[PDB]
Amino acid sequence: EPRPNEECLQILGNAEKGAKFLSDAEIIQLVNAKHIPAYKLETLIETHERGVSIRRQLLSKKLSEPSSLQYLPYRDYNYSLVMGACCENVIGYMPIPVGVAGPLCLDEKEFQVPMATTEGCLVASTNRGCRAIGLGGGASSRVLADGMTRGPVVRLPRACDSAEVKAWLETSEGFAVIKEAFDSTSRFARLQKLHTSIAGRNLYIRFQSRSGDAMGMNMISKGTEKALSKLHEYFPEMQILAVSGNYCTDKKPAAINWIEGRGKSVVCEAVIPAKVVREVLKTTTEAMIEVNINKNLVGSAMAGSIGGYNAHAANIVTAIYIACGQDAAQNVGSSNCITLMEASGPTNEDLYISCTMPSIEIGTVGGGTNLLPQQACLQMLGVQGACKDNPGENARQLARIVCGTVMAGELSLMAALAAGH
Amino acid sequence: EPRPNEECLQILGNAEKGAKFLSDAEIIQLVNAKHIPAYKLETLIETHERGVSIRRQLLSKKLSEPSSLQYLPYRDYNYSLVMGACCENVIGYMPIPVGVAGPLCLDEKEFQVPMATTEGCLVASTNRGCRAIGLGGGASSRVLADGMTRGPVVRLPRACDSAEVKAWLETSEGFAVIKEAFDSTSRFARLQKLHTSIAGRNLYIRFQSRSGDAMGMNMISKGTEKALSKLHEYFPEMQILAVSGNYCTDKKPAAINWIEGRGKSVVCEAVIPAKVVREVLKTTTEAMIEVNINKNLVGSAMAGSIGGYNAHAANIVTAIYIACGQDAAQNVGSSNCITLMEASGPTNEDLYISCTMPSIEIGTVGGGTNLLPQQACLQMLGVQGACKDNPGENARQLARIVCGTVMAGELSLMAALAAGH
Amino acid sequence: PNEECLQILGNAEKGAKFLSDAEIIQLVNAKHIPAYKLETLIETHERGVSIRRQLLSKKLSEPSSLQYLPYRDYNYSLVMGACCENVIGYMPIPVGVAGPLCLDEKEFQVPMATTEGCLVASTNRGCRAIGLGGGASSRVLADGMTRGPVVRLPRACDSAEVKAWLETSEGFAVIKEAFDSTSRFARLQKLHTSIAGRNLYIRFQSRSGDAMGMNMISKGTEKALSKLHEYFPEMQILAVSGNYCTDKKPAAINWIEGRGKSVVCEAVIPAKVVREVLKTTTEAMIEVNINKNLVGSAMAGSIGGYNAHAANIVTAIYIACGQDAAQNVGSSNCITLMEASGPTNEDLYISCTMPSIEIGTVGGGTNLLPQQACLQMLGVQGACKDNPGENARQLARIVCGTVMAGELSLMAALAAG
Amino acid sequence: GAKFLSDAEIIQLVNAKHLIETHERGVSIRRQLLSKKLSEPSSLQYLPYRDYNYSLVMGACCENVIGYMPIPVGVAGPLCLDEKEFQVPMATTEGCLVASTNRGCRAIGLGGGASSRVLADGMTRGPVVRLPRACDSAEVKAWLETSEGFAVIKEAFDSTSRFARLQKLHTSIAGRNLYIRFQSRSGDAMGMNMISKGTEKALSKLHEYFPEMQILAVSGNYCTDKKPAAINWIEGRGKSVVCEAVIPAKVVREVLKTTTEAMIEVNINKNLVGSAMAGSIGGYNAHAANIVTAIYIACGQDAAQNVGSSNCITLMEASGPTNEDLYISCTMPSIEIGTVGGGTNLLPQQACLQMLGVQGACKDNPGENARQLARIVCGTVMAGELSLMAALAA
Ligand SMILES: CC(C)c1c(C(=O)Nc2ccccc2O)c(-c2ccccc2)c(-c2ccc(F)cc2)n1CC[C@@H](O)C[C@@H](O)CC(=O)O
Ligand SMILES: CC(C)c1c(C(=O)Nc2ccccc2O)c(-c2ccccc2)c(-c2ccc(F)cc2)n1CC[C@@H](O)C[C@@H](O)CC(=O)O
Ligand SMILES: CC(C)c1c(C(=O)Nc2ccccc2O)c(-c2ccccc2)c(-c2ccc(F)cc2)n1CC[C@@H](O)C[C@@H](O)CC(=O)O
C-alpha cells in the first residue's frame, strides 16, 4: 500500500489529514526523495514520540551497524517537557543509575542525597562519610555570597575612552542608572557592585545579581543586554563585541570565580570525634591531616592548580547535578573547593574538617529542573521549585547540601587514602 | 498480616525459600529494628528490581514528602549490569534527553554524535557548527599523545633523601626496574617517561601509560602500587603517603594536565569558506576572529584562566560523556581547550579554526560503557568496546570525535555572539 | 694597647675616635669587647662600614674579596637604621637613559638601572617609534595599596559571621574609622574577604599619598583588626599578612583586583614608522603578538604574563628610582595588545595594561639622594603638596609607557628575526 | 682630537647636527646634553658617575650611560650550608631585610645548619613556529619525539658552543602552532645568549626537514623568561633546588621568639592556604623575592629574572622525639642564575661573588660555581622565610 511520493505529498499538504495519515515508510520515502527537510519532522508529525521514532529510523540506515540504537530507550518518556526547551534532534534518553547517600546531618536537619553516577563505590564511599558526620554530631554550613554573573566584552575607540567608561560606571550616579535598567528586567534582578577590567580599548564588565531560586544565566543575560543598551545611550561609540567575553566566567576554569565567587559561595564544617574516625573511617586524625596537607594543599600546588585543593569534589557535584536537573557542564567551576583538616580537642585526636566552595552554580527552577524525574530528586531534598515566602531559599539550601555532601565525600576518600590498599 | 521477625529469619536463612517467601512489609519490618542493613538487600532478594523497590519504600518513609519518588522511574531497567559495578543504594534511574548532532565530517568520515543534555539549543547549535564544517570540506584531527596518569605522593625522612630517589628514578637502570614492575601488572601497562617533583621531603611521581581502550584509572593505579612497592625495596625508608597525591591530576583543574597532557591530547581543524560563514553562521570571518581573540584569549586571560581559552567546550564534552558512559566528573580536565581562529585562503576571507584539547580523559571499555544504553551511543560512533586488531583505536577515535564536535560547538556559539543575538 | 684603649672608650668625652683601626680590632679578637657593640661605640658611619669590612675579610676564604666593592664617600646617614643593616659598602648599577618618551603631551627622559646589554638601546628605539607616531596616552584606572592578613575564629560559622558583619554598612564604618585614624592618607576603601573554613582573609585597600604604602597600610590594618577584636574576642590574629595582599608573590588577586596603581597605555605607530624604525610590518607585529603574548603565555600556563619583557623595564626603572625591586614580581603583570588601525589597516595600534604597579616617590629607597636624582629627572621626586599621590601616579604612568616602548621594540625585533 | 676641544665646543658641534677618547668624559658630555632637556637640569648633580670603570660596561651591559646607582649592600651570615659557611651579600634599600635574614641564619646555625641539593639544571628558550595546518604541526611534534629526530636536532644545537648540550625537548601544539622548549646547561653562565644561538641553528636544521615551517619568533613565551608561568614551576628553569634544616625547639623559642607549633600554623595558613585563596601559581612562600632580589642585585645577576627565580614553596613540620623541633624546607624549581657574563663581568659584582667563593667559571667542573650560587640563594631564602615567619607568628 505505500503510495507514490506525489500522492503522499497531497495528503501531507491536506490540512485535515497530514502526516498522521501516512505510514512511517511513506514519511521516510518523502524525506529520502528530498520533499521534506529531515529536521522539520518535529513540526509535521503530530505526536512527539513518533517524531523521535522516525528520526531514529532515519538515523539507523546511515549508521555502519543499523541496529546500534536497539538498546537506546525512547518509548514512554515525557518528551512534552523536553521538545523545544531542553534538547533537540531527540533520539531517546540515557538512563543514569541513581543512588542515595545519607542521612546527611546538616544544620540540624537530615537529607537523603540523590547521586546519579556510573562510578562504582562513589555512593557507598559518600555514604560512609555521611555516617562519620552523623555520629560526629553533624555538620554546619553557611552561604557566604550569592549571585550569578555575566561578563560581556565591549570595545571603545581608544583606551582613554574605555577608561572613561570604567570611571563612569564607578560613580554612584552612573552605576545607579545602569542598576535601574538591569533591575527593571525581572523581579529578582538586583545588580550588585560592578567589577570591571580594562585591556587596552576593551572593557570587561562583570554583572552580578541574585536570581531567586533559578540558577540565573538567562535572567542575568537579559538584565545585561538592557544594562548595555542603557550604557550605549551614554557612550554611542561603544561596540558590544560579545554578551559573554569569558569574564563571567561560565564553564571554563578561572581565578575570578575562585576569588570573587559565582552563584553561591558556601562553607561547611564538622568535628569528627577520635572514636568515630577510628570506627567509621578506620584511621587516625593525624594520618588524615598528613594526607590532606600533602595531597590537597601541597600536591595541588605542585600541579599548578587554581581552585582544585580537594580530593574529588567534582565526583559529588557531578552526581548531584545530574540527579537534580542541573547543568552538569557547570561542574567545571562548581567543583571549586578547598578542603581543610586540622587537629581538634584536648589531645589533637579529633578531626576538624571544612570544605569551602565559592562558586556553586545551582538552581531549583528552570532548565533540567523542569523535568519530573529530576523534580523527584529535588523533592527528595525538599528544595523543588521556587520558594514563595523566602525567594532563593531552595537554591541556597541545595548549595549547602552540595557542599555538605562534598565534605562527606572528602572524609571517606581521604580516610581510604590515609589507611591504604 | 505481617508475621513475627523470628519466623521471618527462618524463612530467609532457608536455602530453598529465601526472601521470595516474605512480603514487602516483612523485609521492611526486618530492616527496621536491624537484622539486615539495607545495602545487602540485593545479596538477599530474589530480583534486582525488587531490591530497588524495597529501598525506595524504605527511603520514602524517611522523606518529608512521602510521594517524592513518584516520577523517579525504576521499573524494567537493566540493573544486573549496575549492581556491584556502577552504583550503590540504587533507587532508580535518571533519564537524560539524547539528541543527535551531525553529520560531523571528520578525517574523511561522517559521524552522528550523540549528546545527552537538558540545555535548550545546545544540540541544535552544535548541529549548525557541524553543517558549516561539512560544507567547508570537513575537519581534520590528530591524536598528539596518549597516556592516563596517576600521581602518588611519597615521603622520605629528608629532602636530601627525596632528591636521591628522584635522581635514581632518572637513571636508565632505576627507571627500567620500576618500568618492569609497573608493566608486569597488565598487558597494556607500558610505563612512559616518569615526571617527578620535589617539595622538601615529599616526592610526587606521575606514572603515565596507555591502557588499551579503557580510560585506565584502575589499571594505572594497579601498576603504580607495584612500582612503588618495587621502589621501596631500593629505598626502605620511603613512606607511601597516598596513591594519589593530586599530581595526576584527576578531577581538579591543574596546569600540569594542560602542559603535560593527560589521557588523549588532540588537535582538530577546519577551513570554513567565507560564503558558509555568511549563509550558515550569519557573520563574517573578520568578526569571528575579533570575537575569538578578545573573548577566548584576552577575556579568558583577564579572568585568570589556566586552560580555559574557549567558548564552551565543557558543554559538548559533558553531553557526549553522559551519552557514551564516560565519567562526567572528568569534564573538569577533559574540557581543557584553546580555540584559535584566523584568516585563510586566496582572498584571506575564509575562516581557519582549530581546537586543541590536551587532556581528554576517555574510554570505550569499563565503568559506564559496560551499560547497554551508553553502549548504543558508542555503537553510533563505531567506537563501542575494545578494538582487537588495534588496541586503543576506539578510545582514540572517540577523543577525535569529541574534539571535532567541540570545534563544531565553538563555531556556532562564537558566530551567535559575533552576530549579536 | 688592650687595657689602655678600654679606658679610652669608657671615658664619655674621649671615644673610639681616639683609637686606630688595628686597636679596635685587637679588642674584639681578644674577647675584650663583643663585636655587636661596634655600632654603638664607633661614632662615625663610614668608619663603622670599614671596620665591619676588615673584620669580615679575615673570615673569608679569600681575604681580598672586598677589594673592588666600593664603600667610601657615600651618604650612609640616610641608609643606617632605615634602608640596610650590617653594611659593608655599595653596589653600583649602571644607569642609561631612554627617551624622549612622548607621554600625555610631556617628554620624559627615563632612567634605567641595568646590566643587560641592549636593554636601554632597544627601549630607546621603542620611544622613537612612539614619538614619530604622535605620542602615547595613559590613564590611572585605580589606586590603592593592600595588605591581606589572615584571622581565625573557633568555627567557620563564626568566620562567616565576621564576614557578614564587615559587609554591613555599620560594620565597615567602624573598621574604616579605626583604620583611617592612623594616618592622614589612610582612607579605607571596600574590603575584600575570603573564607577558608574558620580562616578569614581580609584584604584592606587604601591610597597612601605618594608613598608605596606598605608600612602605612600595615599600621592601619593592625588598628582596624584591634577594633574587630573588640566585636569578636574569640578571633585570633594569625598573621598580619596571610598572603592575601598579595605582596612579592605571583597571585591572580593582584591581576584581577589590582594592587597599587592599575594603569593603561596606548599609541598608534604609522605603517611607515613600523617599516623604517622597527624594521617590520604591522601585519607581522600583530601575528607575533597574538601567538607569543596571548597563545604562547597561555600554553605556558601564565597568570598575568601576557607580555614580552615588561619585567626588564619595570626592574630597571625601579632600581634607578629607589623602588622595592622585589615588587617587580607583581608590578610586571602586563597584557600587551596589538591590532590593525587606520584607513587600510596598516597602522599599528598598541596598548599595555598593567593592573598592579606597586610604586612610590616618597619613603624607603626614594629617600636616598642618587635615587632622588633619577626621580627628579622625571619630575616626580617626593610628595606632591597640591595633589597628594600625583607624583606616584605620574611615575606609574611613565613605567607603563616605557614598558610599551620596550614591547614595541622587542616585538619588532622578534618579528623581523 | 676631542681632547683638543672643550666640553662646550663638542656639545655645540652635536647641536649643529655634526669620538671622545676617554669613557668618563663621554658620560659627562652625555649628562650635559641630557641636562638641556630636563626641567630641573641640576637634578643630575647627586647622581654619581666619577671614578667608575665604564670600560667593561659600554657595548656590553648598558647604553646611553649617565652614571650609576649605588645600592647599599649588607651581609647576612654566617649561613651554615652543606657543611660550609657563607657570608651572603644582599643589595637592598628595604629596612630590616638584612637584619631579619641574619636572624634566620643564626637560627639555622644553632640547629646544625642547612643541607641543599640541585635537582635539575638547564636554561631554556621556547620559540614558536607555525605550519600550514595543525596536521603538519602534529607531524613535526611526532618527528621531534623520535630518537632520530631528536638526535639530529641535538647535533645541530650542540654544534654552536662548548657547553651546548641539549636535554629532552618539551613541546606543545596550539592548532598549526608548535611551541618547542629547548633546554641545556651553559657552563657557569646564565646562558640566555648560548641557548638562543643553539636554538637558532636547531630551528634552521628543523626547517631543512620541514620547508613549509615558519619561524614566527625565537621566543614564543614558552621558555618562559621573565613572566609568571606554570611551565617553569612544573618543569623547572635554570637550577631547581631544595634546601632544609631542623631547628631545635629551644632555638625556635630563644632566637625566633615563638614555637614550632605556632610556626607550623602560620606556614600552613599563610604560605599554603592564603597563597591558594589568592590564586597563586608558585608563590607559596613569605618573601623569597626579597632575598633573591637582594642577592641578585649584589652578585650581578639579571634582577628581572626575580619573576621566575622567586618561585618557592616553603614547608614546615613538627620534628624530633617530642615532636617539638621545626623541620623547614624551601623548594625553588626555577633559579635563573650565573657566575660569568652579564653584570658578573663587573668588578664590584665580582667582589660579592668572590665573598661566596663562586666568582667566574669553575675550571675543574664547568657549571659548578653557578650551581653553588643557586644553592646559596635557596639557603638564604630559607633563612629569610624562617625569620619573617617567626616575626609574623610571634
Ligand atoms: C570515592 C571512590 C569510590 C574511590 C575510593 C573509595 O572511596 N573507596 C571506598 C572507600 C570506603 C568504602 C568503600 C569504597 O569503595 C578510592 C580508594 C582510595 C584508597 C584506597 C581504596 C580506594 C578511590 C581511589 C582513589 C585514588 C586512587 F589512586 C585509586 C582509587 N576512589 C576513586 C576516586 C576517583 O574517582 C577520584 C580520585 O582519582 C581523585 C584523587 O584522589 O586524585
Ligand atoms: C545553548 C547555546 C550553546 C547558546 C547559544 C546559541 O548557540 N544560540 C544560537 C544557536 C544557533 C543560532 C542562533 C542562536 O541564537 C547562545 C547565544 C549566543 C549569542 C546570542 C544568542 C544566543 C548561548 C548564550 C551565550 C551567552 C549568553 F550570554 C546567553 C546565551 N548559549 C548558551 C551557552 C552557555 O551554555 C555557555 C556560555 O555561557 C559560555 C560563554 O560564552 O561564556
Ligand atoms: C631587549 C633585549 C636587549 C633583547 C633584544 C633587542 O631588543 N635587541 C635590540 C633591539 C633594538 C636595538 C638594539 C637591540 O640590541 C632581543 C632581540 C630579539 C630578536 C632579534 C634581535 C634582538 C632579545 C632576545 C630575545 C629573545 C631571544 F631568544 C634572544 C634575544 N633581547 C633580550 C630580551 C630578553 O631579556 C627577554 C626575553 O627573553 C623575553 C621573551 O621574549 O621571552
Ligand SMILES: CC(C)c1c(C(=O)Nc2ccccc2O)c(-c2ccccc2)c(-c2ccc(F)cc2)n1CC[C@@H](O)C[C@@H](O)CC(=O)O
Ligand atoms: C623581613 C622584613 C624586614 C619584615 C619583617 C621582619 O622580619 N622584621 C624583623 C625580623 C627580625 C629582626 C628584625 C626585624 O625587623 C616584618 C615583620 C613582621 C611581623 C612583625 C615584625 C616584623 C615585615 C612585615 C611583614 C608583613 C607586614 F604586614 C608587616 C611587616 N617585614 C616586611 C616583609 C615584606 O617586605 C614582605 C611581606 O610583605 C611579604 C608577606 O609577608 O606578605
